[PDB]
């Protein structure tokens, strides 16, 4: 029931984790991504995160397993807690706005190179008051 747009988005996201393109996400790959976002997960945290998404016990995530995880996340309502934590991932300087520079930084660090025009468009998907940045209320509205 996923559309070609959605599948394309999920494949692009998968590619940011599966840097070697071997078709699976490993604990090492997940660790690299999370450290690029400014987190410092422990080895146990990474193992649990991979293993809770894995469906067949081989200790890695393939694209069908990732799709199952994403399709569920998209249907689900998001918690206040997880939205607040995610906002801080982008709002590096803690000023209560996600700027175009901060969003581009996060995308670059994940391995997705965007043009300024592409970053600005992603910001437009959330900005409401027209200042070209995303405050917390705008971020919450986007996620709800």
């Amino acid at each position: 029931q996923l559309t070609e747009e959605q599948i394309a988005e999920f494949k692009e996201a998968f590619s940011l984790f599966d840097k070697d393109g071997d078709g699976t996400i490993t604990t090492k790959e997940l660790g690299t991504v999370m450290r690029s976002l400014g987190q410092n997960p422990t080895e146990a945290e990474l193992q649990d995160m991979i293993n809770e998404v894995d469906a067949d016990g081989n200790g890695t995530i393939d694209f069908p397993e990732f799709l199952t995880m994403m399709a569920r996340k998209m249907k689900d309502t998001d918690s206040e807690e997880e939205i607040r934590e995610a906002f801080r991932v982008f709002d590096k300087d803690g000023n209560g706005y996600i700027s175009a520079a901060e969003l581009r930084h996060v995308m670059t660090n994940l391995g997705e190179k965007l043009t300024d025009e592409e970053v600005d468009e992603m910001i437009r998907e959330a900005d409401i008051d027209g200042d070209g940045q995303v405050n917390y209320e705008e971020f919450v509205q986007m996620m709800t």
Binding site: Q6, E12, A13, M74, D78, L103, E112, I123, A126, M143
Partner: peptide, 16 residues
């Protein structure tokens, strides 16, 4: 081709 990830989808990824 360049595949855009919409901002909302990206955030969902960052939830883990």
């Amino acid at each position: 081709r360049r595949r855009e990830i919409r901002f909302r989808v990206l955030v969902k990824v960052v939830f883990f």
